[PDB]
């Protein structure tokens, strides 16, 4: 029963939600190895934990930059939520801490790299390939939404492939716990639902829209709405017109028509039967949802690895100092972190 697992899952989440773990490690417990990517106010590095020899992904945020970009509440959201959740297809926090200048979030390291890198290289996925990944996103969103969490940044850039070829959703900078509607203009242009673009209050339905964009991009090799500038893209999103490649199966087209539905009363995930509309759709008929959660299904692509701490599935970025001021920055703003 999906109902029973989710009931326990919520009991587990609330306890950590109301009493967040805090200051569970320190910088010099970690050997910094390599940068796996960059963000506006920080970055993510491969590091090794000296005590265990375990490798981890460490998100390093510059407190001053966080404040400048008005991402204080959002970053508190990220840490508070990540420390509380636990699901196979999410990178949850193993440790978090802060020092004078930076915030730090340590999560399980995914050696396979981003879906983005592989999708772009190979061009496009087969429908079974794309269905294997979609199922894991369907289940994660089921989990998150039951906890009153909206994710708000689904894209291949945020999906890491693990050693078994399964996905981990990562980067929760825009994730929020909200009952009812919210108004923040956030996310990535290609993946924004029309509600967001038209400055309406919206809810978790925007995640199901973004699932529709992902599945399309995975199966097509490009997104359903693209252009050179964001404003050309929003023009296309609101218009309510998507063209599917001729190789798209009839079942896939029908699924996507129902995910990429501007009409909220008609959009799958947002209806009275919730996620089952998606789960019991014909395109997923072959999917064994339990086997997928248990990781019993054979992944259509297993990443190349040569020992632990291997980074050949990630791009090269310029390595930069982590400087720790002798003076505490932004102590009040990040007191609860």
């Amino acid at each position: 029963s999906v109902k029973e697992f989710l009931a326990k899952a919520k009991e587990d989440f609330l306890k950590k939600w109301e009493n967040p773990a805090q200051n569970t490690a320190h910088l010099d417990q970690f050997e910094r190895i390599k940068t796996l990517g960059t963000g506006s106010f920080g970055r993510v590095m491969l590091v090794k934990h000296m005590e265990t020899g375990n490798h981890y992904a460490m998100k390093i945020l510059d407190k001053q930059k966080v404040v400048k970009l008005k991402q204080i509440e959002h970053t508190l959201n990220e840490k508070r939520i990540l420390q509380a959740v636990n699901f196979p297809f999410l990178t949850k926090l193993e440790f978090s801490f802060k020092d004078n200048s930076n915030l730090y979030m340590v999560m399980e390291y995914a050696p396979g790299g981003e879906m983005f890198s592989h999708l772009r290289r190979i061009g496009r996925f087969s429908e079974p390939h794309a269905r294997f990944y979609a199922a894991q996103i369907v289940l994660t969103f089921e989990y998150l939404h039951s906890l009153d969490l909206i994710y708000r940044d689904l894209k291949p850039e945020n999906l890491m492939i693990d050693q078994q070829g399964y996905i981990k959703v990562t980067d929760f900078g825009f994730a929020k716990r909200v009952k009812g509607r919210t108004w923040t203009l956030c996310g990535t242009p290609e993946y924004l639902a029309p509600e967001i673009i038209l400055s309406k209050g919206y809810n978790k339905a925007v995640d199901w829209w973004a699932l529709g964009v992902l599945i399309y991009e995975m199966a097509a090799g490009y997104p359903p709405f693209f252009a050179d500038q964001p404003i050309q893209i929003y023009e296309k999103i609101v218009s309510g017109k998507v063209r599917f490649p001729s190789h798209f199966s009839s079942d896939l087209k029908d699924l996507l028509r129902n995910l990429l539905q501007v009409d909220l009363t008609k959009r799958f995930g947002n209806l009275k039967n919730g996620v089952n509309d998606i789960k019991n759709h014909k395109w997923f008929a072959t999917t064994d949802w339990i086997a997928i959660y248990q990781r019993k299904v054979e992944a259509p692509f297993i990443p190349k690895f040569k020992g632990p701490g291997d980074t050949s599935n990630f791009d090269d970025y310029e390595e930069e100092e982590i400087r720790v001021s002798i003076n505490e920055k932004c102590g009040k703003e990040f007191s609860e972190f």
Binding site: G37, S40, L69, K70, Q71, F116, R120, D153, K155, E157, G173, F174, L185, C186, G187, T188, P189, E190, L192, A220, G221, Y222, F226, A227, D228, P230, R243, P245
Partner: peptide, 20 residues
């Protein structure tokens, strides 16, 4: 082709999040 238009576009790389 749509593929060719995509590949020729300025948005085949890592896409950044928006804000206000």
């Amino acid at each position: 082709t749509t593929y060719a238009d995509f590949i020729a576009s300025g948005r085949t790389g890592r896409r950044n999040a928006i804000h206000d």
